Design a protein around this ligand. Structure first.
Ligand SMILES: NC(=O)c1ccc[n+]([C@@H]2O[C@H](COP(=O)([O-])OP(=O)(O)OC[C@H]3O[C@@H](n4cnc5c(N)ncnc54)[C@H](OP(=O)(O)O)[C@@H]3O)[C@@H](O)[C@H]2O)c1
Length: 281
């Protein structure tokens, strides 16, 4: 059968030529140990080749075991981790990265992101990212929760421009403007809480649309995101839902459905606002 021929490899090309799978597995709060480890294994076995974690999630080690246990070579897997706010700063970042890489038990990370912008320590933190990139400890470097002015500020103080901006994005917060800005700068967008953190999986508007294709609201959201040119990383600790989220390279939303979903925007965040969130800074 070959796990190879079945893998969910549809990807987009980042500005530096690296291919990043448009569908990834979110790991926020999977409980370190058996839970996170088993869920991650179900994902990898289902065809996922992109995994999203973060130091702050306290489950990098579980992710590592899954990766070391699945039957797929490291080269075919895209692994992302993030630098938590408390570790910003040049030397602090290099040290944080080592801790993360050692828990993941890997020789290199595919993508490393600054978790939150904060106030005035990301530019310095970035030099460390560019250092890790130059040395090849990470194959791509990016940002997370950055508004357009945060990026403009970084672009004035960097040698290498970020390649990804991971932001909260779903039907109630489509982020069309920030997505456009990022595209202008050749920055790929990854959507977090792409299913509205589970609060949109039963939306009548989304379900109705899904009914036209024998697809669920969750699958409709993920497809809407992918067609919008964004990368999506839904999470789940349920084996059947993991497989469900991966069955989105089957159909296509019509121009009408897309306009209907884009029409749902309410500027609603389920998460914190990058402008004010200062935890651990
Ligand atoms: N950089 C950042 O600031 C940031 C912030 C938040 C999240 N993230 C990342 O992005 C990921 C996604 O964010 P998130 O986990 O908050 O939100 P999400 O992925 O939208 O969460 C979806 C919720 O819906 C349920 N679900 C998943 N698939 C489903 C399906 N097919 N049908 C019905 N319910 C389904 C899940 O429950 P079950 O587990 O029971 O399936 C889960 O609780 C995270 O895991 C994390 O890696 C990054």
């Amino acid at each position: 059968g070959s796990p190879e021929f079945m893998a969910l490899t549809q990807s987009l090309k980042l500005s530096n030529g690296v291919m990043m799978p448009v569908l990834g597995f979110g790991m926020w709060k999977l409980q370190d140990g058996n839970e996170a480890e088993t869920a991650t294994m179900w994902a990898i076995k289902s065809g996922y080749r992109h995994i999203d974690t973060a130091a702050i999630y306290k489950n990098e080690e579980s992710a590592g075991r899954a990766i070391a246990s699945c039957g797929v070579p490291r080269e075919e897997l895209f692994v992302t981790t993030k630098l938590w706010n408390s570790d910003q700063g040049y030397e602090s970042t290099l040290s944080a990265f080592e801790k993360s890489i050692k828990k993941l038990g890997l020789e290199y990370v595919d993508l490393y992101l600054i978790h939150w912008p904060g106030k005035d320590k990301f530019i310095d933190t970035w030099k460390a990212f560019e250092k890790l990139y130059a040395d090849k400890k990470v194959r791509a470097i990016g940002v997370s929760n950055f508004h357009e002015h945060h990026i403009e500020e970084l672009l004035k103080h960097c040698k290498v421009a970020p390649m990804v901006n991971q932001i909260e994005l779903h039907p109630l917060l489509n982020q069309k403007a920030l997505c456009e800005y990022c595209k202008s700068k050749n920055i790929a967008v990854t959507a977090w809480s792409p299913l509205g953190q589970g609060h949109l999986v039963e939306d009548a508007r989304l379900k109705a649309i899904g009914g036209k294709y024998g697809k669920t609201a969750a699958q409709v959201m993920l497809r809407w995101e992918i067609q919008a040119g964004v990368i999506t990383i839904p999470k789940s600790g349920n084996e059947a839902r993991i497989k469900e989220n991966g069955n989105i390279f089957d159909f296509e939303l019509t121009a009408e459905d897309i306009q209907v979903i884009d029409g749902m925007n309410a500027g609603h965040r389920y998460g914190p606002d990058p402008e004010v969130f200062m935890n651990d800074f």
